[PDB]
Amino acid sequence: PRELIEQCAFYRLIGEFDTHLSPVPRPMYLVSNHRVLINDFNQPFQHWQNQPYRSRRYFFGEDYVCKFFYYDMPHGILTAEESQRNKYELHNEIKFLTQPPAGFDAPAVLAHGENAQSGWLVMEKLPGRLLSDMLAAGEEIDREKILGSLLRSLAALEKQGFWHDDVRPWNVMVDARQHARLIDFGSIVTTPSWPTNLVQSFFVFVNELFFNLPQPWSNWLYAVWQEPVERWNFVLLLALFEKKAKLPSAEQQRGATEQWIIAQETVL
Amino acid sequence: DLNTLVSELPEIYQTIFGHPEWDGDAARDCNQRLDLITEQYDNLSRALGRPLNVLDLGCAQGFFSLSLASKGATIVGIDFQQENINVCRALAEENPDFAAEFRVGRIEEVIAALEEGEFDLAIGLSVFHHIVHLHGIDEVKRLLSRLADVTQAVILELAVKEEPFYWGVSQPDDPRELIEQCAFYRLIGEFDTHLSPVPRPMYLVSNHRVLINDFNQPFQHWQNQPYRSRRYFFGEDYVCKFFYYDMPHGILTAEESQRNKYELHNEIKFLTQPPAGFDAPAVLAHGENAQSGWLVMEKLPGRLLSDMLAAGEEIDREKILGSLLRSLAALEKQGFWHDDVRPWNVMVDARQHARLIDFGSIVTTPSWPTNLVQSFFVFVNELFFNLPQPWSNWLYAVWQEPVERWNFVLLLALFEKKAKLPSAEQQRGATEQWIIAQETVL
Amino acid sequence: DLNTLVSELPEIYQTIFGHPEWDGDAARDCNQRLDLITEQYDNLSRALGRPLNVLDLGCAQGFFSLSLASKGATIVGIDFQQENINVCRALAEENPDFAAEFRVGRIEEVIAALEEGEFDLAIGLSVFHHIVHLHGIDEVKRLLSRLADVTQAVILELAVKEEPFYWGVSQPDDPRELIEQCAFYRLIGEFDTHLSPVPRPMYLVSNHRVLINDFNQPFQHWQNQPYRSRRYFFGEDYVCKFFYYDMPHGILTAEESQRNKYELHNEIKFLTQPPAGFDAPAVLAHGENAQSGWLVMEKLPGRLLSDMLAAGEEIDREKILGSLLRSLAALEKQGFWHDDVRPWNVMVDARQHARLIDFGSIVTTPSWPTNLVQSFFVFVNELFFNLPQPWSNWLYAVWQEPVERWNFVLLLALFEKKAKLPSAEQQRGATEQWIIAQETVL
Ligand SMILES: C[S@@+](CC[C@H](N)C(=O)[O-])C[C@H]1O[C@@H](n2cnc3c(N)ncnc32)[C@H](O)[C@@H]1O
Ligand SMILES: C[S@@+](CC[C@H](N)C(=O)[O-])C[C@H]1O[C@@H](n2cnc3c(N)ncnc32)[C@H](O)[C@@H]1O
Ligand SMILES: Nc1ncnc2c1ncn2[C@@H]1O[C@H](COP(=O)(O)O)[C@@H](O)[C@H]1O
Ligand SMILES: Nc1ncnc2c1ncn2[C@@H]1O[C@H](COP(=O)(O)O)[C@@H](O)[C@H]1O
Ligand SMILES: Nc1ncnc2c1ncn2[C@@H]1O[C@H](COP(=O)(O)O)[C@@H](O)[C@H]1O
Ligand SMILES: [Cl-]
Ligand SMILES: [Cl-]
Ligand SMILES: [Cl-]
């Protein structure tokens, strides 16, 4: 029955009723093209979006964004594992944002709830554009300020025992002054050798943000690669990043592998 | 009387040759098509050294036929309407020295009856859409193939599906579908029909000759897929590379057309001004326009490396790599590199010496050229994970070099001394091997 | 290169923005449509106080889209042909400060995905006939309704069945059938397509605003059938009366169009120059042309009498008749009468005072006004055979008057003294009663 309504912006199952014709009940939906209608939060929105950058919908109102995740979707669309991951991410995001770590400016939470079909989170609306859009629409970016600001927030999370498992352009928002922040906390984790894998992906992130690294970014990465692995973490990544202009020149060394492994990773 | 014959025409489609009193009545003035067709007539007549035999299919009131007979052509015009042929014959009789014959008949049957060599040039202007409409696209492709098979050149004006009439619906998606089975084709103009704002393209087609205004020569074979926007024609001492920038259907994205354009342009620039220290194939002709570009080069002996690899032919990898590396090092010394050294860009002669044959990927400026040295390892590995000593020792030595030192001069010098280099398998290594093996998969 | 992209267009439908070398090749020059569309852009941009977001459906080579982005618009152009969008993007790149995006896609799917407020203006020029031809008229009406629902204004150029081609047969009888479900529409021009002598009409359509060159305002509701050639739009302090003189299908005979024309014209004349002693609603704007005429007036409180009668609402017939008679007597003193006093022309406010609201039937010269006094009796009777005392006594008194004395001053004076007049039922009467009862049937 959702095929008759899924073209509409907002919809939610609100009940199921016995018809007395048979044992099969009929679902009742609440639908709107103009408002978020959640029992605790009832507000106009002025635009919405399904595909970020179809089980997730975002509604934008004057000072809010409402993230609406379907756990229960029609047709094939979500496997059991995917619904549970929708459930897990939104749940995890609610937990983090309602109790954020000191030293980290997290977007504020205005409302939230979950049920069998879906879950939602209404947050303060942040200025800026999503990094992946800026990259796609070839907009001018300051990679230094983006990486610096992001690394600073990742190092502060790590100091409080938090990491983010999925640092990618579509999870990062860049404001007018080119400062960046994470905007999806579904992938935040609290416990674990580690966090070595995350440091590795962060190199890919870096490379995709630009094989492609000029000096002194390449020198930065080369320095990290010379570190024993038990020492890889975001505090180290940040400290080396801040001093990258002083670090020795990678191209003067045999290297050369860190470059090829991430280039293959960045393909992979 | 001519007056009566003209009046009995169901339509005065064309200008009545020599009789301008009907020019206002003619559906098409024909002067624009005639300007272009006479230019192509002259080119081909010049190339063959003699006046041509010309076939005019659906010749209507004879205008093209008479206009070419006027310039010394021997012409036969065919049309299935008696009224049209009556006018053509009456016009020929006013011009008794023109060698012009006309016959009532169907184009389908005439094409089946043609013999190779009988006509040098056939023209078919705005007639095949009628055959498409009644017999379908596949039969028309075969008719047009036979027409090309039996002549030296064909000129077609083809109606198109964008024309606003009901019969447009039966047309192919693109008029090139009727001709792309033929070996050589080029758009030579576009004409207003006076039926609508949609013009009809005119194509010059051949199954026997490259017909480019500057270069008009037989070819004895041709090839589309190397090792479909690129065609190669082989004549006695030439190869003509013909790239389409404008292709039908989905076929080329914007970026791909521009890359076809870029590569051919870049190749022309390099070959017309090659660097000293590099033997580049010689350039005989070249040009570009909105639809396509072409380059005619001297023909080189040998076989393409990728064919030899595919057809498991015997190869000397030492001589192939040595010769190629020597030419790459000489390019680099002149500030040139090749971005795409692969088996399908390399030709190997009878003495097992190799050279590059596609210069589309040549570049002049940039850390660098480190990436190219890396791919060259893949090339090496595909030419054979798979490296025996001392090739493996060579690669291991390169990998021990600081990266700012990677370049083709170094690659060549180490290659020449590879028998002296230390044994890679005696070292911890081992990674250079695994990175290229993963690269060579990737 | 642009050259290549243009050549690969199946058709150069439009002028290539900034590239006049193809203007001779373009099927349509676009300058005439652009003149009109830029005028409407400016009007709406002025009204909203800002540059607009514009959607261009079937944008082809981008000419309208680029031309409006040039004036500061933010535009999105949609077309289902890759070749067209490749050219649009290449043109936008030559003009990097234009806020212009282009996407390959189908109009049907884009319309379904639109959100209200995203675009202020949508243009759909010569594209919907393709959707009619494949999906039928009803689906196109719904698409166009949604387009109007989500924007402030829509401009359409619509192909028509009189065009001589095979697809004309699938078109509606009249292009207005695709839009007449929308609230507001006006013909703004007619354009030569260069396919035939039949021009295509351009309509300005809105589901949210009255869009008249002199008056551009939101409305919050509208109505066709009063109490279909007349439409009423209600905004905060206005009512806009919009009369079609030119209607599709059979709908208006020649006489009816002329009467629409006559009534609206007459109403404009009266209200712009009202008689002293009569409070007429104020006039905010007005105009007429070949197709239609409009009048924007101050909005009056109250309900239409005929609705109150139909919805059995409580009415004070004394106050209604008194107030109406008073205004009719004051008109008559200034040499004005109203030819059509009926419940649907009368509005009753909260204090039960009544006034006329349609002045189409006002007249200035003529035995007379005896007929009007007669109908006013029917009015009276329908407002209630049905007359109790003293209304019946009033009518009886009027009927005893010589006919040269019948007029609205007399009707009013007798009405005010009706409680004093002799009892009709005590007289032989009895006919005045039966004549109006038969009239009130008739
Ligand atoms: C549109 S006219 C084009 C005339 C002429 N080729 C020109 O372009 O000036 C098509 C002509 O082809 C002739 N025709 C059409 N189908 C034919 C067929 N199957 N065999 C012979 N003639 C044909 C018609 O009689 C007509 O004269
Ligand atoms: C006749 S042209 C009109 C072009 C342009 N609107 C103008 O009037 O100058 C129709 C255009 O609409 C496009 N088109 C037709 N049907 C379409 C559809 N269903 N969705 C998107 N584009 C469509 C065609 O590709 C073509 O560019
Ligand atoms: N708190 C927020 N403030 C502003 N935009 C947001 C917020 N959360 C998500 N978004 C936007 O949501 C859109 C797509 O969803 P997401 O995957 O959350 O980025 C992007 O354009 C983000 O910029
Ligand atoms: N100058 C040339 N001489 C001989 N063969 C050539 C020349 N240029 C290209 N080819 C051949 O063209 C064919 C396919 O096109 P290509 O991609 O150029 O190799 C191969 O069989 C090549 O050997
Ligand atoms: N100036 C006005 N103010 C308020 N309502 C009006 C005005 N003019 C017409 N109407 C309304 O228009 C509707 C139908 O059209 P009409 O035939 O003009 O009555 C009725 O509901 C009237 O009350
Ligand atoms: Cl066949
Ligand atoms: Cl044709
Ligand atoms: Cl249309």
Residue numbers in the entry:
A (entry chain A): 178 to 230, 239 to 377, 381 to 398, 416 to 473
B (entry chain A), C (entry chain A): 4 to 230, 239 to 377, 381 to 398, 416 to 473
What does the paper say about this structure?
The chain length of the O9a O-PS is tightly regulated by the WbdD enzyme. WbdD first phosphorylates the terminal non-reducing mannose of the O-PS and then methylates the phosphate, stopping polymerization. The 82 kDa WbdD protein from E. coli O9a comprises 708 residues and contains three domains, an N-terminal methyltransferase (MTase) domain, a kinase domain and a C-terminal domain (residues 460–708) that includes predicted coiled-coil motifs. WbdD is an unusual enzyme since it combines both a phosphate-methyltransferase and a sugar kinase activity.
Here, we report the 2.2 Å crystal structure of the bi-functional catalytic domain of the WbdD protein from E. coli O9a. The full-length WbdD protein was not tractable for biophysical characterization but a 63 kDa fragment, comprising residues 1–556 (WbdD556), could be expressed, purified and crystallized. The WbdD556 structure has an elongated shape with an N-terminal MTase domain (residues 1–210) directly adjacent to the kinase domain (residues 211–459). WbdD556 is a trimer in the crystal, consistent with its status in solution as judged by gel-filtration. The C-terminal α-helix (αV) (residues 459–473) of each monomer wraps around the crystallographic threefold axis forming a trimeric bundle reminiscent of a coiled-coil. Residues 474–556 are disordered, possibly because of packing constraints but are predicted to be helical. The S-adenosylmethionine (SAM) binding site located on top of the β-sheet. Positively-charged residues (R203, H132 and H133) cluster around the electrophilic methyl group, consistent with a phosphate binding site (arising from the phosphorylated sugar substrate). The pocket is occupied by sulphate in the WbdD556 structure, these crystals were grown from ammonium sulphate solutions whereas the pocket is empty (with the loops disordered) in WbdD459 crystals which were grown from a non-sulphate-containing solution. Our data show the two domains are arranged to produce the unique methyl-phosphate modification on the 3-OH of the non-reducing terminal mannose.
